[PDB]
A paper describes a structure:
Chemoreceptor proteins bind ligands (either directly or indirectly) and transmit a signal to downstream chemotaxis machinery in order to control flagellar rotation and bacterial motility. However, a recent bioinformatics study has shown that the most common extracellular sensor domains found in prokaryotes are actually Cache (Calcium channels and chemotaxis receptors) domains. Our results demonstrate that this chemoreceptor, designated PscD, has a single Cache sensor domain that recognises specific C2 and C3 carboxylate ligands. Of the ligands probed, PscD has the highest affinity for glycolate, and this ligand is also the strongest chemoattractant for Psa.
To shed light on the molecular basis for recognition of C2 and C3 carboxylates by PscD, we determined the three-dimensional structure of PscD-SD (residues 31–188) using X-ray crystallography. Our two structures overlay with an RMSD of 0.1 Å over all Cα atoms, indicating that they are effectively identical. The Cache domain of PscD consists of an N-terminal helix-loop-helix, followed by an antiparallel five strand β-sheet, which is surrounded by additional helices on either side. In both structures, there is clear electron density corresponding to a small molecule present in the canonical ligand binding site. Propionate models very well into the electron density of both structures, whereas alternative ligands (e.g. acetate, glycerol) could not be reasonably modelled into the observed density. Propionate was not present in the purification or crystallisation buffers, indicating that it was scavenged from the cells and/or medium and supporting the idea that it is a physiologically relevant ligand for PscD. The carboxyl oxygen atoms of propionate form hydrogen bonds with four residues: Tyr90, His103, Tyr143 and Lys156 and the ligand is sandwiched between two tryptophan residues, Trp92 and Trp145, giving the impression of being ‘flat-packed’ with distances of 3.5 to 4.2 Å. The hydrophobic residue Phe126 faces the methyl group of propionate, forming a back-end wall of the pocket. Overall, the bulky hydrophobic residues that line the binding pocket appear to prevent the binding of larger (C4 and larger) carboxylates.
Author numbering: 32 to 178
The structure:
C-alpha cells in the first residue's frame, strides 16, 4: 500500500463527481449535434443545470474555457465573462493558466491551489480535478478544501 495508492483513492471521488456532472455537457452537446438546439442554447441550458449541483458540504462545480475565460462559477459569479489569465493565488500559482496547460497536455488531472470557500474570502488550500470537454473547449472542475 503506497502513498500513491492513498492519493489515487481520495481524488477518485473528485474525478467521479466531475465525470457525473460532465454527462450534462454530453447530453446537451448531443442535442446540438442532432440539430435540436443551437450550440449556444445547448450551452446555456447545460451551464444553468451544472451551476446548481452540489455534493458533500456545499462542494460545487465551475466551468472555464481554454482562453481562459470564466463561463460559469456558482460562488464567484462576477468572474463570469472575464479573462482570468492574470489570476494568481497567494502562492503565486496561476490557477486557470495551469488548468489550461494541464488539460492541453493530458485532457484532465489534479491541481492544487488556494481559493476562498463559498461565501468567504480567505483563500484556503484546495485540491481539484479538472476535465476538458473537447467539443466546446470547456474545462469542468470541482475540488475539496483541505478542511
Amino acid at each position: 500500500q503506497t502513498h500513491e495508492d492513498l492519493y489515487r483513492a481520495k481524488s477518485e471521488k473528485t474525478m467521479h463527481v466531475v465525470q457525473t456532472a460532465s454527462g450534462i455537457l454530453t447530453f446537451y452537446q448531443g442535442l446540438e449535434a442532432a440539430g435540436s438546439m443551437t450550440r449556444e442554447a445547448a450551452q446555456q441550458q447545460a451551464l444553468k443545470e451544472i451551476k446548481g449541483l452540489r455534493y458533500s458540504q456545499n462542494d460545487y462545480f465551475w466551468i472555464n474555457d481554454l482562453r481562459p475565460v470564466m463561463i460559469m462559477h456558482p460562488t464567484n459569479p462576477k468572474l463570469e465573462g472575464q479573462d482570468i489569465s492574470t489570476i494568481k493565488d497567494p502562492d503565486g500559482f496561476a490557477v486557470f493558466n495551469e488548468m489550461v496547460a494541464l488539460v492541453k497536455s493530458k485532457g484532465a488531472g489534479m491541481v492544487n491551489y488556494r481559493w476562498p470557500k463559498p461565501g468567504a474570502s480567505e483563500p484556503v488550500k484546495k485540491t481539484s480535478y479538472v476535465q476538458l470537454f473537447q467539443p466546446w473547449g470547456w474545462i469542468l472542475g470541482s475540488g475539496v478544501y483541505v478542511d
